[PDB]
Amino acid sequence: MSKTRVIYPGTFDPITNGHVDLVTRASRMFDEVVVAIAIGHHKNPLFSLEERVALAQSSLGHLSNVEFVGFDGLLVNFFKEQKATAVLRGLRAVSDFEYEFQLANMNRQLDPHFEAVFLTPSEQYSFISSTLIREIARLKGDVTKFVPQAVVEAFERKHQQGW
Template structure:
């Protein structure tokens, strides 16, 4: 069984993430979505909220693709998470050249830790390349419409978060 791991903070899940997840299901038999705890980033959504968002969207995607999709929170090294879930492939999305520089360094470090695990890069769809969770949160915080960048459920969650601010 080909098991892939797509890690991220998903704070929040965007249509760019959904695009990568959808295309990754064609590459593996089981796709594990690793939701990073990463307290250093100070996420807007709690781990439980982020996991719930990802699970809700992935249930729909799994039904359409026939690929098993599992959501797995993690706080350890990415390579250790890959070992935990049995992944031999790490899937990463790229939007622009700036992403590549960071990802290139990460691949080198991950290969130094375990060269049996491959990293596969998927380019974001051209319509989704500008979408970044950080920008989506900023637009939503300032009262802008982010419905073109996230699912309706995530949009409602963002509206709820910023209505309290």
């Protein structure tokens, strides 16, 4: 009836090839995909919101139906303001499944129009998370295989600034 708009929220600290694959797949199935970068009040992020947004834009801007927005506040309010059809999340592991199952039910209690749909990662990206990529990079491991080029460069800048 209305054209579909899906929100893909996260901290994207930084964006990885796992995120890229999910957004690519989502962009084939929904009219509009909003990459929604939570400022991340607490759980302080390595990269600034601005840096995170720019890395997302550079990594995914080739997809013409994808938008990039920073947000703060509640997911469920952002959902309503965006007039979204659903939220999209990736499920890598059992702990993700459990957490998102709970969140979807809480958010649906907060707004009965809330919806959450899930994808599972492609096998070659199944282990990739931002947290793990940060840990490898922090120990000066090479993360080139797992993240876009701009992210590799951003990590190099971060080391030169003493992280």
